[PDB]
Amino acid sequence: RYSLWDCLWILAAVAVYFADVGTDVWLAVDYYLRGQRWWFGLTLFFVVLGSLSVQVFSFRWSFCIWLLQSLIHILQLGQIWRYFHTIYLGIRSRQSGENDRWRFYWKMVYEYADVSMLHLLATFLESAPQLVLQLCIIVQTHSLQALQGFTAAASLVSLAWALASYQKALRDSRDDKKPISYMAVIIQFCWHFFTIAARVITFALFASVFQLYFGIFIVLHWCIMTFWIVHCTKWEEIVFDMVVGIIYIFSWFNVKEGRTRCRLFIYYFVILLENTALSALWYLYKAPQIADAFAIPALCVVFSSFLTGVVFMLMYYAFFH
C-alpha cells in the first residue's frame, strides 16, 4: 500500500530519459565531424522542442533564493529534478511523516504522475519525431553508424518506457483502478517497443519511397484517428481527443472505457493494413538503382517484430487477469 522499496526502477527512468536526451544531443556529429545542415537542423529542432516544452510545462506547475535555485534547475534539467524530487519524497515518506494523508506520500504519487505526464509529452514531441527522422535518414542514405542506431534505440526505448510509465501512473494516481506492477509494466513496454519499432521502420521505408505521399498518409491517419476518437470541459475534450489522435499515429493509448477489445482490434487492423500497404508499395518501388536481394529480410524482420509486439500485448492482456 505504501513504503516504496523499488526506487531503483524509478531511478532507471532517470537513466532512460537522460540516455535519450544525451544520445539525441550527441548527434552534434551531424554538424561538427560529419557536418550536415539539414540533419543537424532537424535533430536540433526536435531536441530543443522536446526539452523546452517539458521545461515550460514544468515551470507552469522558501525565500527568493529557493525560487531562483528552482528556476535555474528547471531551465537546465527540470525533468531530472522532478525525478529526484520524486525519489526524495518517497524516501522522506519511508523514513517518517505519519501526518494526515494530505502529504504523506500522495505528494510523491502526484509528483510521479506529473513527471510521467511530462515524460510522455517530451517523448511524443521529441522521441517519436527523432526516431522516425533517424530511421528515414538511415534508409535514405544507407550508412547505419553505431551512433545513429544507438540514438534511434534510445528514442524508441524512451517512447515505450514513457507509454508504460504513463499507464502505471494512470493506474496509480487515482482511486480504484487496481495498481499495475512492474512485471506487467515491462511487458507493456516490450509490446509498445516492438510495435512502434515495426511502425517506424515501415514509416521510414515508405518515406524513402515517396515522402510526398507519406505526408498525406500521416495527416490522413491523424484525421481519421481524431474523428474516430471524437466519435467515441467543452473544447478541452476536443483538444484531448486530438492529442490522443496524435498518440494513435505510433501506439495505442489504451483507453480502458470498459470493454476495449473491439477498439483495440480495429486499431490493430488499421495499423496492420497501413503497414502492409507501405511495405508492399516500397517493395514494388525499390527495385531500381539498388536491387536489394537482402531486402526480403528487411521486410520479414518488420513483420516478425510486429507479431512479437502483438504477442506481447496479448500476453499482458491475458495475464493481467
From Swiss-Prot:
**Into which family does the record put it?**
Belongs to the XK family.
Return the protein name.
Answer: XK-related protein 4
Q: Which gene encodes it?
A: XKR4
Q: Which organism is it from?
A: Homo sapiens
Origin, by domain of life?
A: Eukaryota
Query: Which ranges does the record mark as transmembrane?
Result: 9-29, 39-59, 62-81, 119-139, 144-164, 178-198, 209-231, 235-255, 264-284, 294-314
List all disulphide bridges recorded for this chain: none
- Localization per Swiss-Prot or TrEMBL: Cell membrane
